[PDB]
Design a protein around this ligand. Structure first.
Ligand SMILES: NC(=[NH2+])NCCC[C@H](N)C(=O)O
Length: 603
């Protein structure tokens, strides 16, 4: 309705549309349709095989898309030969600049001017929706992430889960899904009765509201030191552990104030978190939890366990031998001796709840790889319980952040304190580089840039890999860091030099043929790839791809600054260049937001 329309104007036939491709919002799909249809004619290979066979190129010097011929699986043919042959009689006509042969590979080069005519206009038009696409129709996904425990440490694990999840949610949306961002709070268990008993003994009602997360934490720490100083010959009823297990007796019974106090720990906590998450551009839809598991599903679950015959007691505890389904798993405990539920069981139940409540098409749990088996288990259990949707569950894991524990006394503890230390460290960091700051709101910018630093550093490599939290390296404006993207966005933004509504309009009509410099052709190539980048990332749930793409973008824009000057040029030239810079800035903006960043715009 925009790129295909442009095609009409330019009077160019649209190649056959492969099923599920989206040439309207992804010029690389358009290009894929053209190549498959035309390469299909030369060879005896149906385009349904070529389309998926087209791959990205390691470097832009090897083309835009290529095909390892052997992957086409053509009987008795010499790939080296075919490549040379096809690259010869292959029709570039209006779409490609050239087609080349490199061993058993054939490489395709898009027409830079063709791209410009469609890509720049499309970016400037759809703006913030540029990378968007509807590769999905009426599909709902639940993405559970961060999920800290109340009164307990919000460690690096939670942080990491928080960052990946926030991004996965944004990604899933720009790709057409309906997203339910859920935060499965750790807010139940004997530990809360203890907490309740502790708030009584050392708690302050005013401190609870001023700072629920910190106060409750400090309260928990204190009530524990009592549990230790006791334990011996102390009436195991007037003891702390006693009143804890007793005060917890509110799961069987109701109100008894036993809940009024707890429901406030939870709600006041959630109210604080909401502001904190806002700094990471995350707004949860549902603040669920282990406590929020329906009594119905919990019982229905324990029930179905036997109805299917998976249970088998041992030492007085109920277990499920997943061995026969996957030796890698094991005899998972679902109910211990004292006839009480476990962490694994609350997850089995919570799933059951979430399904009947949302009837999701897919559910994603962003949990550390430390809990791999945990997930793998209640996934295999939900399966044997019959529930079909179990196949629609997925565990997106990740390695651990190391050396982050800045708290000189222990592990990082409170999320907001993290943001704060980052901001502080980035503030004095900004102070040391007189060349970058002249801003009016240092503090504010510091927070945004600081958070940018944390996010980028965390998403640079694969999720599964352990990475070192390096204050020095991450806050710097040097290498491929968060601050680097921010300052780049800022420079690009300034280059647009106030783009009136009517101005961005003349950009759309600029004479792109004036963008003949190679440095420009490379950026244009690059800009057309954003939609494909997102498409690939949801396929892997790896933000690296995006982060790597955004740095290639800023670096190319950097190369362009040296040659594609705007000031002092004729109007026609300046307009064609600014159109490019603007489209470039738009993509950069989009990509950063997707990752969870807040592009610094107002200095
Ligand atoms: N459904 C889940 N198990 N979500 C993740 C829970 C993580 C847990 N709160 C922890 O701190 O380890």
């Amino acid at each position: 309705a925009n790129m295909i329309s442009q095609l009409k104007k330019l009077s160019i036939a649209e190649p056959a549309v492969a099923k599920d491709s989206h040439p309207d919002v992804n010029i690389v799909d358009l290009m894929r349709n053209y190549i498959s249809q035309e390469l299909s004619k030369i060879s005896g290979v149906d385009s349904s095989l070529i389309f998926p066979a087209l791959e990205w190129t390691n470097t832009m010097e090897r083309g835009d898309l290529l095909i390892p011929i052997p992957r086409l699986r053509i009987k008795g043919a010499n790939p080296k030969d075919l490549a040379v042959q096809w690259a010869e009689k292959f029709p570039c006509g209006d779409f490609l600049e050239k087609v080349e042969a490199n061993g058993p590979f054939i490489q395709f080069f898009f027409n830079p001017q063709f791209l410009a005519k469609l890509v720049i206009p499309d970016i400037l038009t759809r703006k913030e929706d540029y990378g968007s696409c509807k590769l999905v129709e009426n599909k709902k996904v639940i993405i559970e992430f961060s999920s800290p425990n109340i009164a307990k440490p919000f460690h690096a694990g939670h942080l990491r889960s928080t960052i990946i999840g926030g991004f996965l949610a944004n990604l899933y949306e720009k790709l057409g899904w309906e997203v339910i961002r859920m935060n499965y709070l750790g807010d139940w268990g004997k530990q809360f009765g203890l907490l309740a008993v502790g708030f009584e003994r050392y708690g302050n009602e005013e401190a609870l509201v001023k700072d629920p997360i910190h106060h409750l934490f400090d309260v928990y720490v204190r009530i524990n030191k009592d549990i230790e100083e006791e334990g011996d010959s102390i009436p195991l009823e007037q003891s702390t552990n006693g009143k804890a297990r007793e005060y917890f007796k509110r799961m069987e019974d109701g109100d008894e104030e036993a809940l009024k106090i707890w429901k406030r720990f939870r709600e006041f906590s959630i109210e604080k978190y909401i502001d904190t998450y806002a700094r990471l551009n995350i707004k949860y839809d549902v603040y669920s939890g282990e406590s929020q598991v329906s009594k119905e599903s919990m019982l229905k679950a324990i029930d179905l366990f036997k109805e299917k015959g998976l249970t088998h007691e041992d030492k007085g505890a109920v277990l499920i031998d997943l061995t026969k389904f996957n030796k890698k798993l094991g005899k998972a405990i679902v109910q211990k001796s004292d006839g009480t539920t476990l962490y694994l069981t609350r997850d089995v139940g919570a799933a059951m709840d979430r399904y009947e409540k949302y009837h999701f098409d897919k559910m994603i749990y962003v949990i550390a790889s430390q809990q791999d088996l945990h997930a793998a288990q209640f996934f295999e259990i939900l399966k044997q319980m019959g529930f079909e949707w179990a196949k629609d569950l997925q565990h997106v894991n990740f390695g651990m952040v190391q050396g982050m524990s800045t708290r000189k006394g222990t592990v990082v503890f409170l999320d907001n304190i993290l943001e704060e230390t980052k901001e502080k460290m980035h503030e004095v960091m900004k102070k040391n580089e007189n060349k970058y700051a002249q801003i009016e709101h240092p503090e504010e910018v510091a927070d945004l840039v600081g958070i940018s630093a944390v996010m980028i550093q965390d998403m640079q490599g694969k999720r599964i890999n352990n990475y070192e939290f390096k204050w020095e390296r991450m806050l710097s404006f040097e290498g491929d860091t968060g601050p680097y993207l921010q300052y780049a966005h800022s420079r690009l933004r300034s280059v647009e030099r106030n783009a009136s509504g009517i101005t961005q309009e003349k950009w759309i009509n600029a004479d792109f043929s004036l963008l003949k410099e190679p440095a420009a052709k490379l950026l244009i190539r690059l800009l057309g790839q954003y939609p494909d980048v997102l498409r690939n990332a949801i396929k892997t749930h790896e933000p690296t791809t995006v982060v790597t793409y955004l740095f290639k973008l800023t670096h190319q824009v950097s190369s362009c600054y040296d040659v594609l000057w705007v000031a002092g040029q004729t109007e026609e030239l300046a307009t064609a260049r600014l159109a490019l810079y603007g489209a470039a800035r738009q993509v950069l903006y989009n990509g950063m937001r997707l990752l969870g960043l807040t592009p610094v715009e107002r200095m």
